[PDB]
């Protein structure tokens, strides 16, 4: 009935929504890191070669 209790309730609900979305993505097909890891390693070696020349 108090504001703080209502807040704790809405807060948990929100955190649960963030968690639902996260899980939903992993089940859907979550790549991200894969692509990211390759682009990181590519820009690295390319800059090295660029600088070398």
């Amino acid at each position: 009935s108090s504001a703080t209790s209502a807040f704790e309730r809405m807060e948990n609900k929100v955190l649960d929504m963030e968690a639902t979305s996260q899980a939903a993505g992993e089940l859907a097909g979550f790549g991200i890191e894969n692509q990211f890891a390759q682009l990181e390693a590519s820009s690295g070696v390319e800059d090295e070669l660029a600088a070398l020349k």
């Binding site: 504001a3 209502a6 309730r9 609900k13």
Partner: protein, 54 residues
């Protein structure tokens, strides 16, 4: 006790329904409003107390 059990079921359903009816975007905000509304009135009391002290 069956009457009390029936009441508990009725209330539990209605409590779940109003929990479902919460809209965090609206509700979270509304809760803050209540906090402010309440504070203002505390401040008025502290206002009087300070004046009386003087």
């Amino acid at each position: 006790a069956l009457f009390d059990r029936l009441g508990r079921v009725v209330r539990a359903n209605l409590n779940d329904l109003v929990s479902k009816a919460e809209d965090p975007e609206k509700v979270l905000e509304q809760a803050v409003i209540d906090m402010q509304e309440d504070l203002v009135q505390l401040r008025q009391a502290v206002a009087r107390t300070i004046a009386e002290e003087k």
